[PDB]
Structure formats: C-alpha cells, structure tokens
Amino acid sequence: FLTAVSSIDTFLPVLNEAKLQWPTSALAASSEELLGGYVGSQFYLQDGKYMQFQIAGSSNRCELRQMIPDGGSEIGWAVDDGTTHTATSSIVVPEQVDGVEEVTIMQIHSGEAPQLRISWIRSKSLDGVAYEDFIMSTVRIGTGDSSDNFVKTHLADRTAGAMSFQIDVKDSKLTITVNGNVVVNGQDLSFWDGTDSCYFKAGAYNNNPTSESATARIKFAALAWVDHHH
Numbered sequence: 731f732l733t734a735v736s737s738i739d740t741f742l743p744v745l746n747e748a749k750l751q752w753p754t755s756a757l758a759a760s761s762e763e764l765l766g767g768y769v770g771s772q773f774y775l776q777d778g779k780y781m782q783f784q785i786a787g788s789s790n791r792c793e794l795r796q797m798i799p800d801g802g803s804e805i806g807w808a809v810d811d812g813t814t815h816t817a818t819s820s821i822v823v824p825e826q827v828d829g830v831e832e833v834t835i836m837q838i839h840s841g842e843a844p845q846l847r848i849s850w851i852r853s854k855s856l857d858g859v860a861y862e863d864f865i866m867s868t869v870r871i872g873t874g875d876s877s878d879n880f881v882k883t884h885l886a887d888r889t890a891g892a893m894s895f896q897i898d899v900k901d902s903k904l905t906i907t908v909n910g911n912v913v914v915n916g917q918d919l920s921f922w923d924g925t926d927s928c929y930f931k932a933g934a935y936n937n938n939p940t941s942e943s944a945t946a947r948i949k950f951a952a953l954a955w956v957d958h959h960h
C-alpha cells in the first residue's frame with residue numbers, strides 16, 4: 731500500500747499551511763486532510779523520505795498551495811508589504827519520461843498570474859544559449875504575451891541528487907538561491923506592487939507536454955514557507 735506523506739514528521743509544518751490541488755486547481759485535500767493521512771499515487775511518501783508528486787496531462791497539476799496555518803483559508807500577500815516572504819525546498823528531480831517537456835516545481839502566483847515559476851525544462855534556448863535538462867526561472871514583469879513580459883534564466887543543470895532552492899521576496903525584489911548560491915539577485919517585482927493576492931506553491935505542474943499521458947514526477951526532501959515574524 732502507498733505510504734502517506736504525513737506518516738513522518740518532515741513535511742508536517744508545510745502540510746499545516748497548504749492545501750493539495752489535483753489534478754487541476756480543484757481541491758484534492760485540505761490541510762486537515764493532508765495532516766490526516768491523505769494519500770494516492772499522485773501524492774505519497776517515496777523511499778520513506780520524499781514527498782512525491784505525480785501528474786499527467788497538459789496544464790494539470792499535483793501541487794501544494796499556501797494557506798493560512800492551522801486550518802485557515804487561502805493566503806494572500808503583496809510583494810511590497812515590507813515583509814520578507816520566503817519559501818525553501820530540497821528537490822530530487824528524476825529523469826523525466828518522454829512527452830514531459832516542462833514541470834513547474836515552485837511558484838509565486840496571484841489571483842491572475844504567475845509572478846515566478848521555477849521549472850524543470852527538457853530543452854530551451856535562452857538569450858542565444860541552448861540548454862538541456864535544466865532548472866529555469868520564469869518571472870513575469872507584465873501580463874502580456876510577448877517576450878518582453880518575461881525574464882527567463884537558467885538556474886542550474888538538473889542533478890541526480892537533491893538540489894536546494896530558496897525564494898525570497900522583500901520590498902518588491904526577488905532573490906533565488908540554488909544549492910546555497912544566489913543565482914537571481916534582486917529581480918524587480920514592482921510591476922506587482924499593490925497586488926495583495928500572492929502566495930507560494932510547490933509540487934508538479936505539467937506545462938506543454940507532447941503526450942497528455944506522460945507522467946511528470948518530482949520528489950521533495952524538504953519544503954517550507956518560512957515566516958520571518960514568528
């Protein structure tokens with residue numbers, strides 16, 4: 731039988747501050763249900779250690795969405811509220827099966843748009859450089875569709891072993907740290923000033939596959955939203 735993520739202590743803090751959305755943004759499990767042992771092939775404990783997310787289908791997801799702690803409702807914060815908002819993770823990204831092209835593994839999202847997606851990418855050229863099998867950040871600096879609305883950055887080549895990530899937002903600036911090294915330093919988020927509906931997400935969100943049957947799979951060794959106010 732499939733072992734539940736809540737059967738160990740590692741993820742209890744974030745599970746107390748998240749709902750699970752699967753296979754769309756519809757609710758799969760409340761925070762209470764997650765802490766109570768919700769489990770399925772889409773969301774189970776792998777190797778006695780990893781919170782594993784799986785999903786197939788274009789734009790489908792198996793993803794945690796930040797909630798107010800202790801059974802609270804959906805959280806919303808602003809990039810310019812003066813507080814540091816922080817998400818940390820340690821992720822084992824396995825080799826992805828054929829047909830999977832991009833898997834978003836962490837986000838800052840609002841009621842209308844993704845401010846930031848950290849994603850695994852099979853193959854893409856950025857600023858005239860081709861990259862394969864890598865982790866990318868995609869930041870929106872507008873709501874348009876043209877390339878001027880995005881800043882897309884190679885963060886790191888995918889590693890077989892766990893890779894640590896940290897996202898920090900303070901005073902309308904974004905920092906991304908990968909394996910302890912700052913890769914994105916003070917990216918401007920001021921376009922989003924006054925948007926009070928931002929929140930963190932993490933898991934597996936499957937983007938532009940070439941087969942809707944192909945199952946994305948992502949293993950978290952750690953995940954937390956870090957409250958700077960205690």
Ligand SMILES: O=C(O)[C@H]1O[C@@H](O[C@H]2[C@H](O)[C@H](O)[C@H](O[C@H]3[C@H](O)[C@H](O)[C@@H](O)O[C@@H]3C(=O)O)O[C@@H]2C(=O)O)[C@@H](O)[C@@H](O)[C@@H]1O
Nearest residue numbers: 789834843844847854855868870875876877880882937938
């Ligand atoms: O390699 C490129 O730059 C391609 O970008 C394509 O447009 C992207 C866009 O830059 C961005 O990555 C966007 O991300 C969306 C995501 O896939 C999900 O649909 C959801 O999270 O919404 C995101 C968003 O709207 O920000 O996806 C589009 C896309 O539809 O592919 C094209 O411009 C492409 O021609 C170009 O090669």
Ligand SMILES: O=C(O)[C@H]1O[C@@H](O[C@H]2[C@H](O)[C@H](O)[C@H](O[C@H]3[C@H](O)[C@H](O)[C@H](O)O[C@@H]3C(=O)O)O[C@H]2C(=O)O)[C@@H](O)[C@@H](O)[C@@H]1O
Nearest residue numbers: 751754755756757793795804837839840841842843844931
């Ligand atoms: O296009 C998407 O799939 C986006 O969905 C986002 O989640 C929303 C979405 O509305 C979703 O259906 C669900 O809505 C809930 C929620 O309670 C909301 O407040 C609404 O008023 O009632 C719905 C309910 O009771 O089930 O959750 C929403 C949310 O913000 O969490 C995100 O998953 C986006 O990332 C996504 O692009």
Ligand SMILES: [Cl-]
Nearest residue numbers: 832849866868
């Ligand atoms: Cl992208």
